[PDB]
Amino acid sequence: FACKTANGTAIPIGGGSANVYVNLAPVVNVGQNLVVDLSTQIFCHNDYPETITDYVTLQRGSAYGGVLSNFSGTVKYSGSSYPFPTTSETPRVVYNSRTDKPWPVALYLTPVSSAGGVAIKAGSLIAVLILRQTNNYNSDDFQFVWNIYANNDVVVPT
Ligand SMILES: CCCCO[C@H]1O[C@H](CO)[C@@H](O)[C@H](O)[C@@H]1O
């Protein structure tokens, strides 16, 4: 079991940590959602799917910078929505193919009020999302840590 991002960065068998830089809506009014769709950025596969089933969870989803201070909302994982920042481990998704498949995680965030200008700075840490992978085979329990950075400024206007 291993992962990679849309920019080609791999996290190998056994886990590790990678930086993901996300493009964001440049202007988000009060009353609008900012969506951070990591399902278009992070992909994984099962290396031996004929004999092993891999189980994958969002173990923890943490908010930083302007996302922690200027926004509020939820995380959708697979077919269900949860508080973000997270207060629990999600249920398991099955990976059962060697073709990379999306990690089905998206943040749906809304402005808590206008910041007066820049609500998320370009290059700032906005989230840390921990993917936990186990299986039905041995006692592997690996963490793939995704540090999410804003690629551009997000303004919540007055
Ligand atoms: C004998 C299995 C060696 C490869 O083990 C790896 O591949 C399998 C299948 O993806 C995973 O379940 C496991 O955690 C490792 O990432």
mmCIF file of C-alpha atoms in Angstrom, residues 1 3 11 14-18 20 38 42 44 55-64 75-77 82 84-93 95 103-107 125-134 141-148:
data_model
loop_
_atom_site.group_PDB
_atom_site.id
_atom_site.type_symbol
_atom_site.label_atom_id
_atom_site.label_comp_id
_atom_site.label_asym_id
_atom_site.label_seq_id
_atom_site.Cartn_x
_atom_site.Cartn_y
_atom_site.Cartn_z
ATOM 1 C CA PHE A 1 0.000 0.000 0.000
ATOM 2 C CA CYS A 3 0.165 6.843 -2.040
ATOM 3 C CA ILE A 11 4.724 8.206 0.203
ATOM 4 C CA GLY A 14 5.115 2.007 5.617
ATOM 5 C CA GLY A 15 3.940 5.604 5.553
ATOM 6 C CA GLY A 16 5.642 8.912 6.029
ATOM 7 C CA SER A 17 4.831 12.545 5.342
ATOM 8 C CA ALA A 18 4.339 14.800 2.307
ATOM 9 C CA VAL A 20 0.440 19.173 -0.606
ATOM 10 C CA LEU A 38 -8.095 16.547 -1.535
ATOM 11 C CA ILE A 42 -4.083 12.430 -3.038
ATOM 12 C CA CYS A 44 -3.495 5.398 -3.134
ATOM 13 C CA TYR A 55 -8.512 -0.452 5.051
ATOM 14 C CA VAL A 56 -7.997 3.292 5.083
ATOM 15 C CA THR A 57 -9.222 5.961 7.453
ATOM 16 C CA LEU A 58 -8.926 9.701 8.124
ATOM 17 C CA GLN A 59 -7.491 9.228 11.575
ATOM 18 C CA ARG A 60 -7.151 12.946 12.320
ATOM 19 C CA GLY A 61 -7.847 16.232 10.568
ATOM 20 C CA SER A 62 -6.337 19.396 12.101
ATOM 21 C CA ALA A 63 -6.873 23.041 11.179
ATOM 22 C CA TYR A 64 -4.183 25.739 11.107
ATOM 23 C CA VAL A 75 -14.917 17.179 6.423
ATOM 24 C CA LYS A 76 -16.616 14.715 4.096
ATOM 25 C CA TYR A 77 -15.028 11.245 4.094
ATOM 26 C CA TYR A 82 -17.942 14.945 10.203
ATOM 27 C CA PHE A 84 -13.645 19.646 11.203
ATOM 28 C CA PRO A 85 -11.402 19.954 13.155
ATOM 29 C CA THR A 86 -11.996 16.307 13.743
ATOM 30 C CA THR A 87 -13.059 14.807 17.067
ATOM 31 C CA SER A 88 -12.823 11.129 16.062
ATOM 32 C CA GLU A 89 -11.465 8.538 13.695
ATOM 33 C CA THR A 90 -13.659 7.918 10.617
ATOM 34 C CA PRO A 91 -14.881 4.510 9.385
ATOM 35 C CA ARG A 92 -12.621 2.465 7.014
ATOM 36 C CA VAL A 93 -12.592 2.648 3.187
ATOM 37 C CA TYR A 95 -8.586 -0.251 -1.301
ATOM 38 C CA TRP A 103 -8.480 9.405 -1.095
ATOM 39 C CA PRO A 104 -12.154 10.527 -0.672
ATOM 40 C CA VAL A 105 -11.587 13.558 1.596
ATOM 41 C CA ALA A 106 -12.945 17.096 1.165
ATOM 42 C CA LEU A 107 -13.129 20.106 3.466
ATOM 43 C CA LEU A 125 -0.220 25.726 6.577
ATOM 44 C CA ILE A 126 -3.984 25.259 6.549
ATOM 45 C CA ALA A 127 -4.372 21.633 7.607
ATOM 46 C CA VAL A 128 -2.688 18.362 8.563
ATOM 47 C CA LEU A 129 -4.618 15.214 7.577
ATOM 48 C CA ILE A 130 -3.546 11.794 8.818
ATOM 49 C CA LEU A 131 -4.385 8.788 6.649
ATOM 50 C CA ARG A 132 -4.232 5.511 8.649
ATOM 51 C CA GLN A 133 -3.820 2.252 6.687
ATOM 52 C CA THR A 134 -4.234 -1.271 8.078
ATOM 53 C CA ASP A 141 -0.726 0.123 10.990
ATOM 54 C CA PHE A 142 0.903 2.901 8.990
ATOM 55 C CA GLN A 143 0.387 6.694 9.036
ATOM 56 C CA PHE A 144 0.547 8.772 5.869
ATOM 57 C CA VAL A 145 0.729 12.437 6.950
ATOM 58 C CA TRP A 146 -0.409 15.128 4.544
ATOM 59 C CA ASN A 147 0.581 18.708 5.381
ATOM 60 C CA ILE A 148 -1.709 20.979 3.371
#
